[PDB]
Design a protein around this nucleic acid. Structure first.
Lengths: 129, 87
RNA sequence: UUCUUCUAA
RNA sequence: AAUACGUUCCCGGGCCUUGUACACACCGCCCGUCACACCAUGGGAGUGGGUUGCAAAAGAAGUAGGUAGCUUAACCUUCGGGAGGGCGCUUACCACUUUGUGAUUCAUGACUGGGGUGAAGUCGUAACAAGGUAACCGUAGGGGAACCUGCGGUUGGAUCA
RNA sequence: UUAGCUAGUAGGUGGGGUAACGGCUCACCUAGGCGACGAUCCCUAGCUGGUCUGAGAGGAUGACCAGCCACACUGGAACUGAGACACGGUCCAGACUCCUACGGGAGGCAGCAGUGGGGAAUAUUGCACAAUGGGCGCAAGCCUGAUGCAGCCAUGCCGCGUGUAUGAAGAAGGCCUUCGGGUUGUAAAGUACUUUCAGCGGGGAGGAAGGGAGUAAAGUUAAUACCUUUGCUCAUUGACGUUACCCGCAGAAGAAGCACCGGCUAACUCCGUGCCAGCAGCCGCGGUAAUACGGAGGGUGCAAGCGUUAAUCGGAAUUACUGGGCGUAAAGCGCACGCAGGCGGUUUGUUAAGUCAGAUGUGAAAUCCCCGGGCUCAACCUGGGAACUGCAUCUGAUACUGGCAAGCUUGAGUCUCGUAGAGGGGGGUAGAAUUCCAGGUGUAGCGGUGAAAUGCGUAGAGAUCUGGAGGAAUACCGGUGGCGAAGGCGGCCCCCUGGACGAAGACUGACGCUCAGGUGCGAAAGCGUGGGGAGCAAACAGGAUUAGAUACCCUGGUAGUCCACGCCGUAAACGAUGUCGACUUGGAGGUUGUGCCCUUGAGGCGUGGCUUCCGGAGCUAACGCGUUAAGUCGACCGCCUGGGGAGUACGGCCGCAAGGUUAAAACUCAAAUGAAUUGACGGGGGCCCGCACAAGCGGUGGAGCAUGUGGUUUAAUUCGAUGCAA
RNA sequence: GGGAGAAGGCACGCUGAUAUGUAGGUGAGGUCCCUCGCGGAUGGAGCUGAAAUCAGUCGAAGAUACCAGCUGGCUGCAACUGUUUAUUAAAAACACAGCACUGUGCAAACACGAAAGUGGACGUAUACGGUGUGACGCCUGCCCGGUGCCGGAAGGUUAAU
């Protein structure tokens, strides 16, 4: 049943944009926060609110612009059936670099343009555009 | 199309064959005339197509269209074929 | 209740 | 003059509607035996090749082992021999070759099975409309041929004071 | 449609053997070894750098150059030697060829030429060791069919010509024409100019540098012998060679051709031709006016070549890793189970495997790329660089994925009370019906169809009542209800038994998902033994029916339908939608729980499970789906790849068989196909009209003649009209 | 299950070694227990004795004599083991398990018996009698006119009376 919480997360983001919701909540993970603390920093969400003691629940705030949405695309690169590990030179450019690609390297979670300036590759999670 | 199925079984690209097998990947092959005759074609056209039954080099017995208008062909004659179907 | 068929431009 | 109740049916036309594989348009499309012709093929008493397994036979040359025999310039030496070598002997291995039995593959084969194809044949008209017994899947039976019928299922079927 | 393979095999011990280790060999133990990550067997094949295509991913490919390997008439074996199982060595067997006085011998172009052969097709018994090397020698040298040259083929890649200006009378002529003209066409003619190349004649580098001799000095030694080293002279060394290059010479001279014009795709007329001749990559042209045939003119495309065929990728995303789909266009197994398999909640450490980073090694050269250089440029040659996408090693890195431990509880699973149910087997039991049997009553028909008839009846049927027997199914309830994974399950009762849901809880600690191969279930018909057999009903029989009726209809009627136990394993086994998650507008229901509110009556507010219709976004080729997705995403499995052939052949598998199952190929076509639109049509449905029918009356068709047509006849019976509409 | 001893091929003597008798079999005297026996263990002398390997060695030949299968391929018929023409015929004939029909409710049917009675059967329809067919596999169509058989009792016919 539960084969990924990450692909659960991005689709809950994806279906919440079209549903025009302001708050998408889900149970939280350590890796989930490490991604959610990028897109606020990268300016694709407005707020995330990690709460919950017995079980942490991540509650998001969707960023909307001129009525319509901000997240024009949200994907998954390394799926659980097929993992993706690209070096620092094979880091992509989402929408010719205008979008961002979330990569997890040994130095935590960052974006690809930071990882190029970090000069070290790793596991590409998803594409956000 | 699941990659595990793609792992357990590769994509079988379909293998195509020649429509002109008697030349056996040659440009032209020598032949011997066996019977020279005419043949009515199929429904949309009505003619007497001059044509010859040919014994080849490799023992194959094929038919091959006589192009042009008029010829001097006999049986037991040495000819040369290039290919091409007649529709 | 019964009742068929129309060649090849 | 007669007669018109009437619109059930007939013929035609219009309108809405539905079905539809039709579209030089139901005088439409369409099917299968059968007859003829063409094309490749299945099967097939067999037939002739190729390849190979298997079980043994086979033992040239060669080398290795043994060696009664014949033999033997350097070396030992009493000068007699010593070892060794030669030659032959036999043994081991093995090529050529042979036997049987299989297997596999190609070619061929009286005859026979369907298949596909026809600008004109013969027989019927099953399907397409409720195609004039709705259609079709299974399965079984029957029957020149489409097919028919029984049981079960499907709608990918029309009808409705 | 190759699943089992192996006995020195696999391992050990010991001995032997080889340069070396080791069933390398042998002996003796052990029974191992291998395989679904494809062993085994069959088919095909020298391998790589590379080459070709492709944007890439890839695909194909291995001539030429390289690196390796293998082979040398065939089959064998050793020998020798550091190195051989030796193309140009031996020995044996074979084959073939040759010589012989017949006793015997000899022979190996896959070296370079060449000959024959085969073939669609691939060159000279060519020259020369000058250079470059290689072998021997102190050297000189000797040899080299390695090597450097020439011939040969538009075999390929390049570079170059076959002139340049001018020239309208728009010449002639051709073609075409609206006969006016147009076009060929500045094209040619003519004029002025140029002489590249080829030719001819003359001239004239580099590749020839080295080395070689004679000499000088130094070193070495007793040496000023020799020798060595370094200077100096004499001569050189060229096969190509009549070189590269340079001047003369002469004239526009000696030098352009294929393919194409219907669309696809750049470029049209005319004339011949009449489904003939033909054309043809595809669609398709020719059946008297052809831009598609043939010819001409004109034009387009290329060019010393131009076409056709062959052959490979691309286009083709048409196997979709990049980069596909499976509701109906091909495609989700009939479902369920489940191993291997792949996949995995959460949190903490650990590990550092994967992964990432760095560094070393290697990834030969060539090639390709980039920057240069050289040949008059170009092709070509060549310098440097990058690249060679890898692999090995070392140093890290710790987010994730693993590995290791510990936890947590949401996932998953128990415990507790209940709930609904055609959920399952087993055994009873009812009531109607039908049939049959027996009897009473009673009389002449019954039955069936569209009509009938077969049939049943006076031997008393039918009908009617009474009695009895038997099998099968279980009205009403009943429901776009219920349950089961489906296949499916329907009177009532009993016995055994399953699943689901809900409620409060308690617990467990990730215990999960999917699942090739495997296992079970699995409608109906069919099969096997037994049983049973009312009704019904293939086949079959009769009767109709019709042109025919092996059918539809009637009257019969058997397997079969029922039961027990087994086989078969297919169904439009359909929701034509595989399973388990998560998210995402609603409305109207059905069914089944369970809280609250006074139930203030059949009420309201909740909260679950399941299911039906509608329908938003979204998606969809459309149709539609639409919180039970055909929406958005996750995991894993099954499948698809033009149509016919064909789920067929041939093998295997399974079965008593029927068959099931696995699963092609040849050949053939340019379609097949899905939705949806417009018409048309329906022995489809509504609504309306018409001397359409009905209601009427008179006629035609009988007769004779008139008139017209057909036919026949004729020397000729002029021609045309020929359903309705001659 | 078989076919299949398919077919086909190899070994075979003697001597020695292994081991001057081995594998094995038998098993004392000993020794201990002993409820002491027509004992139990232990114990192994003794005798008896395969099979194999290795190495020799003889012949033309070693299962040397006697003894003791000719095999293969196709097809007819019957499935088979069986039974038979004593004394010219052993089979395709018969029988057969199997199948089908039919009869029969026990004082059975039926048979032998003038009868009594007996067999049937001390069996009771999963029984018995008869006929046909002859395993097993796949099967087994049509015709009741005829001839039989069965069922019917309306009418015609009709005995003794």
């Amino acid at each position: 049943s539960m084969q990924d919480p990450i692909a659960d997360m991005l689709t809950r983001i994806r279906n919440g944009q079209a549903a025009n919701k302001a708050a998408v909540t889900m149970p939280s993970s350590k890796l989930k926060v490490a991604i959610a603390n990028v897109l606020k920093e990268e300016g694709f969400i407005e707020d995330f609110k990690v709460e919950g003691d017995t079980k942490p629940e991540l509650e998001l705030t969707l960023k909307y612009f001129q009525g319509k949405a901000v997240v024009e695309s949200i994907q998954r690169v390394s799926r659980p059936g097929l993992r993706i590990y690209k070096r620092k030179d094979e880091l992509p450019k989402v929408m010719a670099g205008l979008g961002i690609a979330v990569v997890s390297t040994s130095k935590g979670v960052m974006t690809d343009r930071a990882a190029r300036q970090a000069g070290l590759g790793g596991e590409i999670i998803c594409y956000v555009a | 199309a699941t990659v595990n199925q793609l792992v357990r079984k590769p994509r079988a690209r379909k293998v195509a064959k020649s429509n002109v097998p008697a030349l056996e990947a040659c440009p032209q092959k020598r032949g011997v005339c066996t019977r020279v005759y005419t043949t009515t074609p199929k429904k949309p056209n009505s003619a007497l197509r001059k044509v010859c039954r040919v014994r080849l080099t490799n023992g194959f017995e094929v038919t091959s269209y006589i192009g042009g208008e008029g010829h001097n062909l006999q049986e037991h004659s040495v000819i040369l074929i290039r290919g091409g179907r007649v529709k």
